[PDB]
Structures are given as structure tokens and as C-alpha cells.
Ligand binder design. Structure first.
Ligand SMILES: Fc1cccnc1N[C@H]1CCCOCC1
Ligand SMILES: Fc1cccnc1N[C@H]1CCCOCC1
Lengths: 265, 264
């Protein structure tokens, strides 16, 4: 992988692995999400991070995902080479945004796109906060100054408000728990695990006859290593749409909410 | 990746990813196991198995893992390049064996080694069988003829008999279930998931103060997508553990194993 010529974006190529694919011999949405995370991390590293700035480490602040939005046109097959370009942009004092473009390395065609919203939070108290000028000036030199959006369209799905699923849910998958493979290097549940948990309450027949085109996920609260999660889904819809809710098994505390759009094969 | 000069083994390099590492910023044993599986699949593809041969497909036969043995001296760090060499060998009528050698690409030193036993099975009835000479001759042209062992030493850990853990277990993790990410392209639970499940009953304090040096796992029966598993561990000792994976309900054995851990 490498930063582009202007140093304002990063590209990396990946060869799709045997264990990374599902029944159609194409990459699952969780493999795609893992690759987006890996290219994001390689971009932060190439521009001097170890992505907390100098001022952020001093003040015990971190970037946390508030929303993830992915749209896939074609999932790459086992052994195929996918090229992913990523970049960041400041969204004023609200936080930051990281976008991605997925391309087939052989044809050069766009096969997918993603966008994410990140908010600043104190690592210890979990208290959200706005972005100060001191922090903003430190990461602006690594961002394109003019807007560059993976989802430019005026009324696109990435900025839609997601409602809270009402009980009773049409479908459910109960008692989901993270294992050590689900944790990141800091012992927190990896953000991609939540995507997997949301998808667990979709019936196998839908997965067997449809392809996931779009997923939008809001991150409200994190699941601890010793927490248990319930995954809830209700059909809201040639295309099928679903409303999703992840909540703690006991008290029913919301951890995530989301929507998926699926097209018939 | 590519076959070596003689075409009797395969090498591939991997750059360790951010999500592939644990708390020490080094690859977990499950990442290592995934890489061994990937290089194994790439070897089979390079020699024409787009690893079932022509005769196996007609007779509805597949290779299934009976045992996996891994020894790690150094886990590669996040961003490091690891080189893995793999090869296969016939073990007469019993089945086949696949071995691996892990090396640090920069230093060239051996950082790990692995060996696995595979048995022939009818994919529909799940009935084990011996290897026929028709099948044996079809894969012998892809194997070194003289023995080449990742674990040569006489009386070594890879061939030790593993006993069945007796109730009550010292430690346990119950109600483990596979999710879709745990399944392979054929909708079966990936072999690496069982390694993860075995490790779930090891206490976090042991994981926080020790490094896993050796793991031996016997595969008795598969866990279906709708099955629930209980993971059981007892200290037998460096720290050694005896492991048992069984179905949550009837208590049917799926795996048994042992782990050896060194203090950091
Ligand atoms: F770029 C990242 C660096 C570190 C962590 N996550 C990143 N990106 C997203 C991965 C895909 C699923 O959504 C969550 C976040
Ligand atoms: F070479 C392989 C091809 C396909 C599947 N597994 C392979 N190898 C081992 C993977 C890691 C531990 O489980 C034992 C088998």
C-alpha cells in the first residue's frame, strides 16, 4: 500500500483469501469491512500516527465510530485482487469522516463504496465532545481541503435517520457473545463484529437467495467482552429491506441500530 | 505465492494485519491457523486441484482434518512479513499429512512449525475409509518421495495420545455458537473456529501473563451451524492444560486437545 501522489489519500491491493468468502465463493460483507479497517489503519500509519494526534494523547481523547455505511455492487471472488482507496475529511467541530472506494484491480471499475462518521471521546469517562481548533489543525494537513465524497448524491442512503425497532421483532438471534478473536489489540470488541451480529438475525433463506447491497449501522454504545447481545430484525419492504436492533440481553440497553437492503440474485 | 523449484512444496508471504493481532500487537494463534489454511489452499490450486482428486469427486470422497499440531517460538508483530512453506506427504493407507514451516521474512529464522493429519471420508455418509492405490497414485506426484517432517524428533509432542477430560472441569465457557463468519465456503464450521473455542475456557489471567507455545487438537466430530458447544479446561501441570469441546445438550465429544504455555 501507499499514499497517492498528492499525499491526501491512500491505496492498497488485497488478494481475497479462501476463508474470507461465503457460499457464492465471493467475499462476505465482514471481509470487506475488515479490509476497509486495515487500509484505514495503514493510511494513519503512513502519515505519522501510531489515529490519535499529539494533543489527543495528552488529553486522553480517541476517535470512535458513530456510523458506518457500505454499498456493494459486486463482491470480489476468492483469489481476485481488490483495490481500495481511502481518505479523511474534517466535518468541522462535529468530528471526522473516512471514505472508501473499492475497485476491481483488473477492470478498474468501482465495485463498492463506503463512508463512516467518527466522533471525539474521552477514553476513560466515555464522554463525547466537539473537535477543538488545536486538534483540527493537526489533522487538516492530511485531508483534501475541497470536499471529496464517496456518496455525493443529494438524497443518498448514508445520511438517512434510522428508527428504533418496535417489539415484537419479526426475527431474532439471542445470546450472542464475543470470543477473543472478536476483540481488537486494545481488548475492545472490533467494530466489524457488530456488523456480523446484525446479520445473524436475517433468515438463512434471504441470505441464500439475495445479495446484500447496502448496510447502514449506527453505533450507540459498545459491547463489553463479558456482555451478551440479542440481534433483532423486522422486514420493512424485487428488493428486501430490513430494520435492525442490537441490544444487551439482560436490561435491553441499545448498542446498535441499522438497516439493510438486499437484491434478488 | 508460488511452488518451489522442484514443484514439491509451496511458499507464500503475508503481511500481518491490524485486526489479526491481540493485546501484545502480535498475531493470535487463530490468525496463524488461518494463514496455514490459506497457504494450504493456494498449494492445492497451483497443482491443479481447483484438494480432492478426479477419483475422489466420482466417489463423493473428501479429505477431513483428524489432528492439528502447532508450535510457535515467536508470533509475528502487526506489519511484519511472515513466510510460510507447506508440503504434503502420503502416510500409506491411513491418510495424508500436511506440514508447514513459518519463518520471519527479514531474518530468515524459523519462528513456528505445524503438522496435520487428514483422513478420507465419504462426504454424504461421513464414513471414514482407507486410501486406495488409485487415489494414492494421483497425489503422490505432488509430494516429496523421501520423508520431510516439520516435527522430525523421535517421541515428539505432535504424536502424543490425548486423554478425555474428566468432569468436573476446572474452567469452562458454555453456550458457544458459530455465526456466519465462522463458516467456510461450503457452509461447514471452519476448522480454526474450534481452536478459538478451545482457547475460550483458558482464564484471561493466563492469556495476559503467558504466551501459547504449543497446541495439539484432535477433531472427532463436526459442530453443525445450529449446534451449541461447551468448552472445558483443566490444568495438568510452564503451564499445561487438558481441553474438551462437547455439544451443550447431550455432551457428545467434538474435540479434545492440550496446550502448553510459557511465562512472558
Ligand atoms: F478505518 C478504521 C480504522 C480502525 C477501525 N475501524 C476502521 N474503519 C471501519 C471498519 C469497517 C466497519 O466499520 C467500523 C469502522
Ligand atoms: F490446508 C488447509 C486447507 C483447508 C483447510 N484447512 C487447512 N489446514 C489447517 C487449517 C488450520 C487448522 O486446522 C487444520 C487444517
Amino acid at each position: 500500500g501507499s499514499l497517492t501522489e498528492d499525499g491526501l489519500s491512500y491505496k492498497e491491493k488485497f488478494v481475497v483469501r479462501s476463508y474470507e468468502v461465503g457460499s457464492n465463493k465471493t467475499a462476505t460483507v465482514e471481509t470487506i469491512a475488515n479490509l476497509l479497517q486495515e487500509v484505514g489503519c495503514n493510511h494513519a500509519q503512513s502519515v505519522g500516527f501510531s489515529a490519535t494526534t499529539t494533543t489527543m494523547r495528552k488529553l486522553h481523547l480517541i476517535w470512535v465510530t458513530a456510523r458506518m455505511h457500505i454499498e456493494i455492487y459486486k463482491y470480489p471472488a476468492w483469489g481476485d485482487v481488490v483495490e481500495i482507496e481511502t481518505w479523511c475529511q474534517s466535518e468541522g467541530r462535529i468530528g471526522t469522516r473516512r471514505d472508501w472506494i473499492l475497485k476491481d484491480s483488473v477492470t478498474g471499475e468501482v465495485t463498492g463504496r463506503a463512508t463512516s462518521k467518527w466522533v471525539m471521546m474521552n477514553q476513560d469517562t466515555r464522554r463525547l465532545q466537539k473537535v477543538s481548533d488545536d486538534v483540527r489543525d493537526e489533522y487538516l494537513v492530511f485531508c483534501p481541503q475541497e470536499p471529496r465524497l464517496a456518496f455525493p448524491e443529494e438524497n443518498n442512503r448514508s445520511l438517512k435517520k434510522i428508527p428504533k425497532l418496535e417489539d415484537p421483532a419479526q426475527y431474532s438471534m439471542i445470546g450472542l457473545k464475543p470470543r477473543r478473536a472478536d476483540l481488537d489489540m486494545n481488548q475492545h470488541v472490533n467494530n466489524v463484529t457488530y456488523i456480523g451480529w446484525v446479520l445473524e438475525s436475517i433468515p438463512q433463506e434471504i441470505v441464500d437467495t439475495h445479495e446484500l447491497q447496502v448496510i447502514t449501522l449506527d453505533y450507540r454504545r459498545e459491547c463489553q467482552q463479558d456482555d451478551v447481545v440479542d440481534s433483532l430484525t423486522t422486514t420493512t419492504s424485487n428488493d428486501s429491506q430490513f430494520l435492525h436492533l442490537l441490544r444487551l440481553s439482560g436490561d435491553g440497553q441499545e448498542i446498535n441500530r441499522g438497516t439493510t437492503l438486499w437484491r434478488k440474485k
